[PDB]
Amino acid sequence: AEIKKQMEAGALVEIAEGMATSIAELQEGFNGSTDNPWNEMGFRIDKQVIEA
């Protein structure tokens, strides 16, 4: 609730941004860089059962 009030107020606002090419080019160890891994995703798969 407080966060929403601050958003309405324009005090704290929604933001999104891409990666600097200065970083993406060397992400995950290129040219001796370090501590810069790429983010990743995939899937799970679970189940439910019933009984008469």
Partner: protein, 79 residues
């Protein structure tokens, strides 16, 4: 400030030998200077651009030779 932006350079601490370490370091280099000379490759580092220097230690455009020495210093091993 340089008003042309900075390249913010972070060196990650690594060990070299018994009681010999390359200390982590955080410096900012004026873009017009970073882009002129640098020896950072294979250095165990990370870097990003910014409108104002991100770190307390800064190499300004007119400090070319402080920066050259500083690049070499990022490879230096101490106690």
């Amino acid at each position: 400030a340089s008003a042309r932006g900075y390249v913010n350079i972070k060196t990650f601490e690594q060990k070299l030998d018994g009681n010999k370490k390359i200390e982590g370091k955080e410096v900012s280099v004026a873009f017009p200077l970073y882009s002129d000379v640098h020896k950072i490759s294979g250095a165990h580092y990370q870097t990003f651009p910014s409108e104002k220097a991100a770190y307390s230690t800064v190499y300004e455009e007119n400090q070319r030779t402080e920066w050259i020495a500083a690049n070499e210093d990022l490879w230096k091993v101490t106690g």
